[PDB]
Symmetry: C3
């Protein structure tokens, strides 16, 4: 099993290393930084329009968009899932309250471009934290674990790469053992299923 | 489409119709406006004096329904990522009245349950973030917030927030959320014992009052 | 009055507690809360990085063979009771532990109710403590020393730069259940759990090796 799971990780990491992707972290970061310094609602709408223009058939429609609460690692915010597959996902994340906690250690590289508010990150193994402002882009690398903190008006555009199904375990831990808000769990499963079916339908049409 | 699960769906539906029918026709003791007004009368005063005056008024207008001072104690409450303390004045299978608040800065998930809850802030601040929005509102002493049935919001409190809270609905379902952090995070089973203790005392007081009538 | 196994299990657990509590009175610990408190208060009001180094040097001087070496030191995240910080474990046994705790973010939550008396001397930042059964909290500043007694439960809150020297006495294995609750049911950071078990095992083996050499 030692060589078994090692070869399995060789196969999975080889697929992630050779898989023609749709998005890239630089693309979403530039598109978000162009609209940084504006109202986060205007930035959200313009970014959604640009994403559907440059990537048709990959972003959910306005009818299928909804703010879903996200409780994880001790912080609470809300997300609007724009795209999601087995290796990529794009969403609009943020909170209207002061929260913070564990960022989560998962098999996925995540990039967050702050549109408004503040982002305090406390990296592992240090005794000092850094504060990031609108326009900045933060890269949560694979296997990294940090402490995150957000202000009462933080909103950002987030893109994640890697083995996405592994990350959902962390995204639903507090919803199971703390909030017990199973309706929010249903909303998350619903919008994720819609994004997966949209990506599957787009693959079928091609 | 026919299956035994269709009967389970209709069975839960008729079970809900029966339970919601009981909740819709059950002569209650308190009402949210009564508790809200009594708490708003004492807003702008020292919250300890307000607590005492509210307890005296509740025991005057509703004898045999509020616990005595011997059975009152501040119990910590950890739920949804926030932490506060409660003083349970009355509790039944459909209603409960308590004095809630925190002396530290906490916040998190308000909880989605089968109960309508009303909180009248005596002192401090209350930040509420409703579901599906991108902006939150801040409520000040005197305000009254109604957390409706099935609603889920994000709450945040200051380092000196204190309020009088009244809840209506299917109370036993809500206790699962009130003890989640106490089981999987704090593991402070002594606080769990205190919560079960004051809950049992309030239920037995209400049962004894019904027996005397 | 047919207690049967019930009246005996109650008395059995009572005898076990008297056995353990007698052992804690006859264990003749190495450190004491006043010793660690003074050593931390001497360097309060200075940079917490400099204070950490001087306290580690003083601890290794006055108690050789009881503090981990620099090779075995690493900052490990600590998630418990709803708050998140970091620790640097200097010494740990079955009845004592010494570490440098603190956080660089604003956190707070349940202090945890366990079978151990804990003393924290703040080097920098602020410490808000909310005792059970009260409606007001107190704020402690660098130089102060807070004693979380056995069986006590308070609400803790720390600022974005709070750092302290902490010493714990009592039945240490019971406390690890609370220290790893959020890491299991909230963070799911199994690598941090591995780090915690790693540094804890190193401290236990160091103390065992020092006892064997004596
Ligand atoms: C995996 C995951 C982590 C997370 O946390 C908030 C994002 N950021 C994380 C790091 O920095 C702070 C905020 N949400 N989320 C998620 C939740 C639900 C999802 C549903 C479908 C697809 C991806 C889905 C992804
Ligand atoms: C069900 C429940 C929710 C809760 O949360 C704090 C209240 N508020 C909620 C919304 O707004 C913020 C604060 N406590 N609680 C509870 C806990 C223990 C109880 C024991 C006996 C009777 C009712 C008992 C009720
Ligand atoms: C049991 C425990 C609680 C805790 O919390 C931080 C300490 N303080 C608590 C009260 O005041 C605020 C901070 N860490 N910790 C721990 C974690 C890992 C340990 C490993 C080995 C030995 C003791 C070990 C002890």
């Amino acid at each position: 099993v030692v060589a078994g799971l090692a070869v399995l990780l060789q196969l999975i990491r080889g697929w992630l290393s050779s898989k023609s992707y749709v998005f890239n972290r630089e693309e979403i970061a530039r598109l978000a930084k162009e609209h940084s310094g504006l109202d986060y609602e205007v930035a959200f709408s313009k970014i959604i329009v640009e994403l559907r223009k440059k990537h048709p058939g990959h972003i959910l429609q306005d009818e299928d968009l909804q703010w879903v609460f996200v409780n994880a690692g001790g912080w609470m915010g809300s997300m609007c899932l724009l795209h999601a597959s087995l290796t990529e996902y794009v969403l609009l994340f943020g909170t209207a309250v002061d929260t913070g906690g564990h960022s989560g250690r998962y098999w996925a590289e995540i990039s967050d471009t702050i549109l408004s508010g503040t982002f305090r990150q406390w990296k592992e193994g240090t005794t000092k934290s850094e504060i990031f402002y609108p326009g900045d882009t933060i890269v949560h690398e694979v296997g990294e674990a940090t402490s995150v903190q957000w202000s009462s008006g933080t909103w950002m555009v987030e893109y994640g790469r890697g083995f996405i199904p592994s990350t959902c375990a962390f995204a639903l831990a507090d919803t199971i053992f703390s909030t017990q808000d199973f309706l929010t769990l249903f909303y998350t499963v619903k919008v994720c299923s819609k994004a997966l079916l949209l990506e599957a339908s787009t693959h079928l049409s091609q």
